[PDB]
Amino acid sequence: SASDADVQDQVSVEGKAKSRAAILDRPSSLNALSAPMVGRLKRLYESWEENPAISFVLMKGSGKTFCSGADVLPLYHSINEGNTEECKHFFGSLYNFVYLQGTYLKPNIAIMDGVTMGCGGGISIPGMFRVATDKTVLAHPEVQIGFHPDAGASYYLSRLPGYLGEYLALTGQKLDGVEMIACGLATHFCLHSRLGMVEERIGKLLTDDPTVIEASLAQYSDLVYPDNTSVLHKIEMIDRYFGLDTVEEIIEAMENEVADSGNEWCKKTLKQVKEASPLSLKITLQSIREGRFQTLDQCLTREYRISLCGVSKTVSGDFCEGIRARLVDKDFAPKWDPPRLEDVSKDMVDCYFSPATDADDSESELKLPTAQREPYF
Amino acid sequence: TLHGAVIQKLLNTGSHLGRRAAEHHFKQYAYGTRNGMTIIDSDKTLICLRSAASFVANLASARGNIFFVNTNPLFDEIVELTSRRIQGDAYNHNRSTNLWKMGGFLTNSYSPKKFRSRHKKLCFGPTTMPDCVVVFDAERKSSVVLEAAKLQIPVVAIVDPNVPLEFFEKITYPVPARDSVKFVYLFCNVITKCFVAEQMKMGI
Amino acid sequence: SWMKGDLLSKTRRLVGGLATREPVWLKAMEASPPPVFPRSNGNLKKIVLPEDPYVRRFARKHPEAKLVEPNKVSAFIPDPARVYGCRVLELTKNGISEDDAMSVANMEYLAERKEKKKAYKRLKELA
């Protein structure tokens, strides 16, 4: 048709000798993912995997932003109109794309040339190669909007060393590219001004071998070491404080040290924590610690259950309230459904992790082609 | 950044101070012109160096023969030590210092040779054809590049700003630099270390 | 021969078509391919520094200043003319007048040269 000319502009394709690149080009929303963009991306990557004339694939972003996450305004307006089906379809499409990225048969490389938030990391970090630049900033501010770090973010944050995944998922702390190399979330590093050099090198490789691509990326990459003021030089604080059993224990211990030691990092971390919804902090901690000992299909499954519970407004409307407060009204002062952490019960946070497939319903479960893909990651 | 320190080490050798009036095919390697000189991008120098060193290191695994040709007397010792380390027991000092002067030493390597006198010493061609030739011929005193291109053999060479297109087209692994003593030493030291690090990985 | 391409692609097509037996170096080239850079349009830029007119104005004065050029110890220490030009440039960026900037920079240089002259005089008195 002719109505899909905007979607083909939103997800461009650049072709090279034996490789294809998907480019996100939605500059109004800072390359935020919509449902047709995810559908086009899934179609493109399936066709490129099927094609034996394509050796490896790429994902880039145009502008100063790589991907700012999912486009939640459309989902908010859909939830306001009663029906919850549009949010559902967007979520299993997005998690299906993330599962495709995690189990992809050819090499895939992501160029992260700007701000990466939310599911923007979810479509790239399960990949085989990841390139970070000096403009790359990674954050996970889902608790401060009333939602949870989905799209496989409970898979790769939970596998970081120590308890840094909990700190990142609860505070929404920014990571730089050098720090992302140090955490193992990025494979290679290069400057922004040097990206045409690596992109021209990668474009005209005629190899299927991931070792050749890795050697080429390392040869054209840049050598960096983390600074003294990095987050990873304070990892022992993360393991001391964010390793506690419950959220209130962490908050109380950090408050006690702020009363005793007056640690400026502790004050800044408290100001980070106090801006989040009490419900999603607990759901986030539970899902981060549950995802440490399970595979990607399982993680995406219970992340889908959490998402589908959070959009039905079963126990809270913190999703719509956070979206409205920080995107629509822009007064940036949300009021959660529990104002306090102590109001959140165990039964409320177990409603998000429940087997909704046991309620005589089928589309409340995440479908995944585990038999055809035969997972190996 | 550590990469700035690596670039600074390449600048310490002076390998970026090339000769003026660069050719057309060299300007992809240049940063600019200043003080009557062509200034070479040391970042591209490092990338080309890494490519050449990784190619030469990969030939240790397949037990490929690497032939060195040096025509500059300033680099006799560096290239001599490198060839002694890399070629192993199959090193011949007379062939390494004299055979490149003969036109046809690779394309006609099975031709007979005759002993005459003390002379300029008798040297025969290599018994096996080399899988790579590493060339240090800034003044083009030998026909090594032409014979290697005739025989389909890869060439690793350091390219000056004034290399002809007919010679540049046949160099498989160019390294854009001024061939100073320090840069040739660094190049040969990197080549030596990569080759013997790959060679120790096999029990050898 | 009449085949087109570089050594790698020509050799791949010859080996794949069963024309030539595979050389030893072919896998080593495929593991570490020769480097490639983008097209440059051939316009090499004259490297100009903002302090260069002031350095060349210091060349319109006393030429005998230093043996730093044939000292051959390092290529990363500035000489007297470059640091003079940088002093004038940062003074201009402060907003001071131009001729006053050259006057004070030259006076500071002359003071430093007289101070190292009297220091070397102290060395010779100890010698």
């Binding site: 001004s193 | 101070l17 200034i39 | 520094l49 044939p70 220490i77």
Partner: peptide, 28 residues
Amino acid sequence: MHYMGLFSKAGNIFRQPRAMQAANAMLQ
């Protein structure tokens, strides 16, 4: 070209070698 631009904001990395100055003295 980032690194060459940084290292050009330094002392004199654009100093001619001894052979080039020798040939320039030779030609004049």
